Structure 1
């Protein structure tokens, strides 16, 4: 009885219930409450050797494995969630997308325009919410819905 895409889950380590969104891969302790023509998102992309274009402004030849990319994504999420780092700072420094130079901002878009998993996560996020790891042919994304 939860917003689109949410399910109850059980923490293995602590035994406490949490909520998981299978569209955004977000997870959180707190019970979520609750479609625009357009949303605005920022993202942090980590590419891997199987990315559509395994090359970025950071690295002419991206050689990391998808597993390694996911560990990096997980570490960025941890630091954003802890407040040790800001999303925008990590995107500027470490996103393999050319949008890193705009602190990850992709601007506004509607359905049909972005890769489908990215699109679906974006529209399932509430304004201000952040995804978990989202997989596309580009690689692995942390998505921040800003509008």
Structure 2
């Protein structure tokens, strides 16, 4: 039972059971339910410890890692509440020129991407979204589209 990476937990505030994934950092109340290639979109928030602390939006990225996590956490909130489309937030705020494609990164096999990014992408099912995903480039929201 439970697909790869998925676990069961309990809210400390309500005692209600929920489900979460260690590889993707996704979490949800609903019970969840390997290809050669996957296609994902992403939204990257960089921080001052990113490998290259620079992006098309900002010549020198100054924010802290914890500050980047709070932006990512707020963007996920906007996405899950339906206040904002994933594509609209990536186009505007992703610290990566994949923003021009609304976050699309194309299709890729294993062996190309940063490993935690790769592991998260291949643990997502088509249509699913990650929680914060930590890599040397910063913090990612990943959306698997194929």
**Aligned match of 1:38:** 37
Report Cα offsets for 1:73-132 as digits up to 9, x if no partner.
000000000000000000000000110011000000000000000000000000000000
TM-score using structure 2 length: 0.99
1:32 deviation in Å? 1.1
1:14 deviation in Å? 1.7
Report Cα offsets for 1:25-84 as digits up to 9, x if no partner.
000001111x11000000000000000000000100000000000000000000000000
1:12 deviation in Å? 1.4
Distance between the aligned counterparts of 2:101 and 2:141, measured in 1? 15
Q: Which runs of 4+ in 1 moved over 3 A?
A: none
1:15 deviation in Å? 1.3
**Aligned match of 1:9:** 9
Distance between the aligned counterparts of 1:122 and 1:16, measured in 2? 28
TM-score using structure 1 length: 0.98
Distance between the aligned counterparts of 2:68 and 2:25, measured in 1? 16
1:13 deviation in Å? 1.6
1:79 corresponds to 2:81: no
Structure 2 unmatched runs, 5+? none
